[PDB]
Design a protein around this nucleic acid. Structure first.
Ligand SMILES: Nc1ncnc2c1ncn2[C@H]1C[C@H](O)[C@@H](COP(=O)(O)NP(=O)(O)OP(=O)(O)O)O1
Ligand SMILES: [Mg+2]
Ligand SMILES: [Mg+2]
Length: 341
DNA sequence: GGGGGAAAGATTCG
DNA sequence: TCATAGAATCTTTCCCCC
C-alpha cells in the first residue's frame, strides 16, 4: 500500500494559541480540572515549551505547577477542539475517502488510488500540511509508509511540524533496529514482558517459539508482532464507527453512600444520552474508580434497547451490585452504553 | 470440542 | 489533597446449548 498518517501537533494547546495568539512563546498547559480541590485533575496536553520541563499529558496539575508555576493553565474546552478537528478531517476526506479517523487528532489515509510512489506521497503530504496551515493555522506531522503501523512510527519520529517517509528498505532496517517498545500498541507492561524474554527488536519474535510468546503477551499481540516482523502486516484503512458512548465523573469527596453518589451517576447518564443522539443502546455498564485507584465495573445486556428511564434504574442496581461485592470507597463514577441498534 | 455470547478485568493511548 | 477522561481491543472465565 501507500498509507499517509496525519497527527496534529500539541493539538488542544495549539488551538488555544490560534484563538489567543499572545500565548505563542510561553509554555501552555491544558487541564482537566476534577473539582476535588483547587488545581486537582490532570494535564490533557502541553505545548512543546512546557514539555521541555517534563510537563506532558497525563501528569497531575499540582505536579505541573511545582515545575512551571507561572506557565499559563487553561481549562480543557473539548467541544471547541472537536469542532476544529472535524473541519480538518473534512479537509482530509478530499485526498481519499478511504480514511481511518483514529483519534480526535489523527487520521490514516489510503492514498494508493491517488499517487504513484513515495516521492509522490511526500509531495501530497506537503500539499496537506500547507492546506491545513492556511485554512486553520494548525501545524501537523505526516508519516508515510507501506502500512498503518510504520506510518504512525514515521510521524512519531518526524515530530513536531514534520513529514517523514519510511520506505521498504528502512522498514526492513527498523524490523532489526527499532526498540520494540516504540511499536504502537506496546505499552510498558508489554515492553517488560518482552525484555524478560530477551526480545528487544521486532525480528527477535521470529526466533522464539510461538507458544512461549503467546503465553506471555497473549495470542493477539504475538501474531501482531510476528506479522510486523515478516513485513506481512497489511490491514485495511477502514471507517470506524463508534461502538461505545459514555461519561465518567469525579466526586468532590470519596464516598460509598448510595444517596450521595446518585447525582454524579445521573449526570453521567444525562450526558451520555445527549451524546448518544438517536442511537439506542442494548448494553449498559457502571464504572467505578475506588479510593486506591482500581477500576471496578458491573454491566448488563438487554434483548431490547434501553430507555433513559430504564438506564436510570438499571444503573442504580448495577451500582449497588458494586457496593455490595466491594469494600472500598468510590472516587469516580461513570456509565457506558454499547450494543447499539 | 466448539460456537457464541456474555461478564469483568487488563493494556494501550493506535 | 497526586493520579482526567474516553474508547478500542483483548484475555479469562462462565454459560448453554448442540
Ligand atoms: N492523556 C490525555 N488526557 C486527556 N486528553 C488527552 C490525553 N492525551 C491526549 N489527549 C488529547 C489532547 C491532545 O492534544 C489530543 C491529541 O493527542 P496526541 O496527538 O497524543 N498529543 P498532542 O497532539 O497534544 O501532541 P503531539 O504533538 O505530541 O501529538 O488528545
Ligand atoms: Mg497530536
Ligand atoms: Mg494523536
Amino acid at each position: 500500500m501507500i498509507v499517509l498518517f496525519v497527527d496534529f501537533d500539541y493539538f488542544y494547546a495549539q488551538v488555544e494559541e490560534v484563538l489567543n495568539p499572545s500565548l505563542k512563546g510561553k509554555p501552555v498547559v491544558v487541564c482537566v480540572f476534577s473539582g476535588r480541590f483547587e488545581d486537582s485533575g490532570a494535564v490533557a496536553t502541553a505545548n512543546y515549551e512546557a514539555r521541555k520541563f517534563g510537563v506532558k499529558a497525563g501528569i497531575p496539575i499540582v505536579e505541573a505547577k511545582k515545575i512551571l508555576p507561572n506557565a499559563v493553565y487553561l481549562p480543557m474546552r473539548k467541544e471547541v477542539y472537536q469542532q476544529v478537528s472535524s473541519r480538518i478531517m473534512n479537509l482530509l476526506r478530499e485526498y481519499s475517502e478511504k480514511i481511518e479517523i483514529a483519534s480526535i487528532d489523527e487520521a490514516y489515509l489510503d492514498i494508493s488510488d491517488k499517487v504513484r510512489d513515495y516521492r509522490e506521497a511526500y509531495n501530497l503530504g506537503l500539499e496537506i500540511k500547507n492546506k491545513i496551515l492556511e485554512k486553520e493555522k494548525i501545524t501537523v506531522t505526516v508519516g508515510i509508509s507501506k502500512n498503518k503501523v510504520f506510518a504512525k512510527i514515521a510521524a512519531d519520529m518526524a515530530k513536531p511540524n514534520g513529514i517523514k517517509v519510511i520506505d521498504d528498505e528502512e522498514v526492513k532496517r527498523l524490523i532489526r533496529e527499532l526498540d520494540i517498545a516504540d511499536v504502537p500498541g506496546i505499552g510498558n507492561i508489554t515492553a517488560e514482558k518482552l525484555k524478560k524474554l530477551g526480545i528487544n527488536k521486532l525480528v527477535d519474535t521470529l526466533s522464539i517459539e510461538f507458544d512461549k510468546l503467546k503465553g506471555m503477551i497473549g495470542e493477539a499481540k504475538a501474531k501482531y508482532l510476528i506479522s510486523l516482523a515478516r513485513d506481512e502486516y497489511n490491514e485495511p484503512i477502514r471507517t470506524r464507527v463508534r461502538k461505545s458512548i459514555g461519561r465518567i465523573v469525579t466526586m468532590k469527596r470519596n464516598s460509598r453512600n448510595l444517596e450521595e453518589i446518585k447525582p454524579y451517576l445521573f449526570r453521567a447518564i444525562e450526558e451520555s444520552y445527549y451524546k448518544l443522539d438517536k442511537r439506542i443502546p442494548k448494553a449498559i455498564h457502571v464504572v467505578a474508580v475506588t479510593e486506591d485507584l482500581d477500576i471496578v465495573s458491573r454491566g448488563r445486556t438487554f434483548p431490547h434497547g434501553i430507555s433513559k428511564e430504564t438506564a436510570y434504574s438499571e444503573s442504580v442496581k448495577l451500582l449497588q451490585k458494586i457496593l455490595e461485592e466491594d469494600e472500598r470507597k468510590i472516587r469516580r463514577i461513570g456509565v457506558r452504553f454499547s450494543k447499539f441498534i
